[PDB]
């Protein structure tokens, strides 16, 4: 399936994944094109924060669903 | 100044905490005692799969905004 990852600049990016793909593996996929380590990535859906252990199907994410991304650039 | 962190029990109870990054593991447990009633004597906190030592800090362990800990009780 296909999903969209939205930043804060408005620069929405495309992606391709399976339901069985882990949250950790998704952040790694964004790194390959965006150049930001997974541990600096915060992924959001439906209002929930997503944990690096569940899968896409756990939070029940479908095709063409939007994810929101927050970067850890400043700590605290 | 203040951060928000989550503390997950294994009973499926999640408590939200207000902490400073500069806060110590001891103060965290004391905050857990303050609203939950569980003694610091009998608390054991986990982050990134490691136990957290009393004398150290939240920042020592790279605990960040909206991070999640697990709380395991001892007997």
């Amino acid at each position, epitope marked *: 399936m296909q999903i969209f990852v939205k930043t804060l*600049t408005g620069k929405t990016i495309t992606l391709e994944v399976e339901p069985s793909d882990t949250i950790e593996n998704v952040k790694a996929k964004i790194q390959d094109k965006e150049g930001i380590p997974p541990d600096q990535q915060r992924l959001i859906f439906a209002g929930k924060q997503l944990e690096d252990g569940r899968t896409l199907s756990d939070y029940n994410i479908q095709r063409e669903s939007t994810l929101h991304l927050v970067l850890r*650039l*400043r700590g605290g | *100044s203040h951060m928000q962190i989550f503390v997950k029990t294994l009973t499926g109870k999640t408590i939200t905490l207000e902490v*400073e*990054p*500069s806060d110590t593991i001891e103060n965290v447990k004391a905050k857990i005692q303050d609203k939950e009633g569980i003694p610091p004597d009998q608390q054991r906190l986990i982050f990134a799969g490691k136990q957290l030592e009393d004398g150290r800090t939240l920042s*020592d362990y790279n605990i960040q905004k909206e991070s999640t800990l697990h709380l395991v009780l001892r007997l």
Partner: antibody
Amino acid sequence: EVQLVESGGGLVQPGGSLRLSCAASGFNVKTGLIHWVRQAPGKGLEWVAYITPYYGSTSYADSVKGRFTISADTSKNTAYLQMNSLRAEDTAVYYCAREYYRWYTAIDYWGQGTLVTVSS
Amino acid sequence: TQSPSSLSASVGDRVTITCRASQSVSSAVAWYQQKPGKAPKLLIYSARSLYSGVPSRFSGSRSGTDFTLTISSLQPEDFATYYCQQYSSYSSLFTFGQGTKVEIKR
């Protein structure tokens, strides 16, 4: 290994302008922020500006705001400090540095600094 | 803007430098050590935690609104200048305090 090498320092008339460069290596600047900080001879540190290269957002000290322009070029991995309306009191060594989320606001790597002197 | 203030101490002394602070400013206070001719080095971050490779004789503490740097027993290489750094979430401005130069008593 992380390195920050600043250049472009030197001599300007009051009123003149100058561009400082800060070339980074051993890490990618878009994974954090880059700061400029200056130190007048025999005096304390003074924060000047910071940029977050990934977004392009900036912040400036009061003593510098209307006349300095911090900026970054990700492809070159370099950060710049464009200094206009320069005045004698701007005389200092200028360091660039970086903050990485893991050190909770603190600046962990600093270059050796370049000398800017403003005088007629 | 100003010259650092001077502290006279002997090898083995306990030194506590304080950094006066505001309610506005965040408790993410950092400390740096700077030697003559060279760039500052990070000692303490987030008020009281040690940067990688900093000796244990360095500690940091929060005295209410104020923040402190302590060196429990002064070694010869500790004689230098120390700066606190503050950060405000409201303005996104950073500020370094005056700077304290510890010199050797004899």
